[PDB]
Every structure is written in C-alpha cells, then in structure tokens.
C-alpha cells in the first residue's frame, strides 16, 4: 500500500513473541528479566485480531520475521527479532511461511494492513566482534560484505554512526557495508521478494540513521510500499531530512516533548506546542510521520506516572495528531515496565480486557478519527494546528472547516479541579452543537464563537459537530 494509502491508518505495534500464543494462554509465564522466548506466534495474533480491531486500529506492525542467532546470549534469546542471521529463513519460533501468509490474509480479510519490521543495517552474533564466523550469515556469508570491526566512539561523527558496529562484545551486530553494490542489490532483491511473498502492506525500517542516506531510496522503491524509518534522534534538523530519502520516519522529534508534557502535572505544554509547529512547518510531510509515546526501546509511559488521566490524554494526542497513530501492545492495559527488558511484557498476562480505561479511550479516539476520515477526504492532509496552550492545557484542530476535530488535552491528572475553559480559535460557527465524543456529552458554541469546554478529572475532550455524527454509531 502507498504512502497516500497509509495516511488514514492507525497502527497497533506488537512484539510477535509477547502478544499472543497459539494456545491462547493468559497465564503462561513471561518473566521479562529472563529475556527468553515466551512463545508468542503469528497464529496467536490472528486469534486476537478482534481485540486489536475492537480498539479501532486499521493496521499492525510486527517485529522482524527473519531467522535469528540460535543462542540464549547473556542478553537473552533473539525473541525481539533484531539479531538476524539468515534473511531467507523465517524465525521458526513464530510459525512457518504459511502462518505469516495466513496473518497477512487474515488482516486483509478485515480490511486491515500488515506492516513488517526490517533491519538492513546489521546481523546479530553471540559474542565478541573479533570472534564472528561470517559463514553463519545468509546470503552475506563472508567478511567481505561487512564494514571493518569498530564501535561508535563519537556519535557526532556521522561516518562512524554509519560505518562502525552497533552492540558490544557480548552480542555483536556485524555492520553490513551498505555502500557496496552487491549489498544494495542483495537487500533490494530481498525486500521486494519479502513484500511480494507475504503480501506486506508497509515496512517499519529500523536502524535508518546507521545506514548512509543513498542506500534508502532504492530500498524504499524495491519494497514498493510505504516505508517508515526509525531515526532515533529528537532533533527535527537531524531526523526530518531522512523523509527526503524514505516515505516516513517515526516522530522521535514529537516523542520527547509529548512524553515530557503528559508524564508530570508540571510538564511543558510550550515545548509540545512549539515542536508541533516546528514539525508541521519544517519536516517534509508531518502527515506521513508515525506518532508514538511508547515502544520497546524506551520506558513505558506508565513507568513515569501511573496517573490514568495523564495516560488517557497522551493516548488521545497520539490518535489525533498529524500522521499515523502508533500504540505499543500493553499501552492500552496501562503497562508500566521501564527500560529493556522490562518494557517487553506479554500482552496475554493482562487477559486482554476490552473494558479497561485505556482500551475504551483508544476505541473512542480511533472511532472519531476513522469516522471523520470516512466523511472528510481532507482530514489526513490538514496539518494539525495548535490553537491554545496554558500551563496545564493544549488544544489543537484538525480537519476541513465545518468538519474539524478540536481536541483539548490537560496534564492536571486525575485530581484536576472542575472548571470551564472558554476556547477561542476552534473555527466553529456561533451556536453550533458539538459532541464531546470521549464522554459523549454536548457543548454549544457561544454567540461570540468561543467554546465553553467543561474540564474535570484532568480528562481529554474531543469535539466534533453533532449534525455530522447523524447515522453514525458514535455516542449511539
Ligand atoms: C520469495 O519467493 C521467491 C520464489 O520462491 C523466492 O525466490 C524468494 O527468495 C522469496 N523471498 C523471500 C524473502 O522469501
Ligand atoms: Ca551501518
């Protein structure tokens, strides 16, 4: 599916080993500190598609599918998929090629997309970089395919960032020489044939900043689908330029101020407001970035704060911001693991309740986004406009005049006082009826064009014209 196809999507990102087992167990041991395979599979995902689609997601992103180093390393098993050795075999832990095709087919049958995580930067190897036997890599079964062994000493030297090896002498990450035509042609042939064989709709490309920029356009073209890159840098001046060599990047620029705004009742609404405007103006296309606050490479939101209202606001922002919402499996069950490996909790241990606070908030926010997009072909290309901030509030508008969603977020948290926000800049007409679609109440725009938004419990508010909901299932 194309970048234009992907603008309307909403992604549930999951770790294949940690989402769902073939047997459907909700009690099977998964001690994150063990760093071992817990037994999640592609067939498990299929079994739990009702749970995902119930939150209004239109797509999933699964961790990589390639065969991994076989060892239990000092850092555990390759349960996460980022230590590949044989790119022409699947990781048999998750199932067979027929299971991965069944997953693709099962999503397509529900009108959903499959995104697959891929790494071009490196292979994985158990032990020191000086110990690597290159014959274990397929097809790259020679040291000739690899950069000379060195570690990044200076993260400000982009040549070192690209040409030296990630990892360490515990688990080494042999760095492919992606400047060689032989390595480009291998990878390009591979990714086109992966996408074709499994009917994949999009890719998440990990590790993008560690591969020189001139590699990426031919890879993205060979894939023939929307590719969203991981460029792990909060500076839009570093990260944004990568969207000129690949369709999208993950929104690490928004990540930091978004986390900081909502993780604390003292979080900066200014830094978030300013980064929204910086990305909107400066990044090649904010509507093709991936919005997130939680993944397997950072502490979970609830590891910073267990305040449920703060979690509800940050989830509402992710769904209603420019670009593709991305929620990480467990975020909807308020998982609180810190850094790796604590943030790779098994989703099944929650028992997959569909009546949890954040399951319902995500379902409501995805419902209004999916509905608004179905009625407004301009929603996805209207760049989100921050219209208001104060010390505890940000309000934003997205969508064609007459059809705009106006979202008011707060960091007051669950002990926030009851009060009325007189919101200007919404652009609704005096006297129009709005539905607050989270709480399913009505608000009427003033004669003066200001919106009197009831604020309570630090809860997010999401406004949309009542007449435009006619015949919809929203707030039945
Ligand atoms: C896709 O299937 C074709 C036909 O067998 C094969 O040549 C190719 O290597 C496969 N690609 C992947 C990555 O499975
Ligand atoms: Ca590299």
Please, could you describe this protein's structure?
This protein is α/β, with parallel strands linked by helices and 476 residues long. It has two domains: 1-374, TIM Barrel, CATH 3.20.20; 375-476, Immunoglobulin-like (Sandwich). It is built from 14 helices and 21 strands. It has an eight-stranded parallel β-sheet with strand order 11-10-9-5-2-1-13-12. Strand 18 and strand 19 (441-444) form a beta hairpin. The radius of gyration is 22 Å and the shape is globular. The chain starts with a helix and ends in an 11-residue tail after the last strand. The site of 2-acetamido-2-deoxy-beta-D-glucopyranose has 5 residues, from helix 7. It catalyses: Endohydrolysis of (1->4)-alpha-D-glucosidic linkages in polysaccharides containing three or more (1->4)-alpha-linked D-glucose units. It comes from Aspergillus oryzae (Yellow koji mold). The record marks 297 as: Transition state stabilizer. Keywords: Calcium, Carbohydrate metabolism, Disulfide bond, Glycoprotein, Glycosidase, Hydrolase, Metal-binding, Signal.
State the helical fraction. Answer: 25-40%
Based on the structure given, which CATH architecture of the largest domain is correct? Alpha-Beta Barrel
Number of strands: 21
Q: Profile the largest sheet.
A: 8 strands, parallel
How many structural domains does the protein architecture include? 2
> In whole angstroms, how far apart are the ends?
33 Å
What structural class do the secondary elements suggest?
alpha/beta
Strand line-up across the major sheet: 11-10-9-5-2-1-13-12
CATH class of the largest domain: Alpha Beta
Shape: globular
- Report the bound ligands by name, code or SMILES: 2-acetamido-2-deoxy-beta-D-glucopyranose, calcium ion
Strand percentage, roughly? 15-25%
Give the CATH topology of the largest domain.
Answer: TIM Barrel
The DSSP helix count reads 14
Radius of gyration: 22 Å
CATH superfamily of the largest domain: Glycosidases
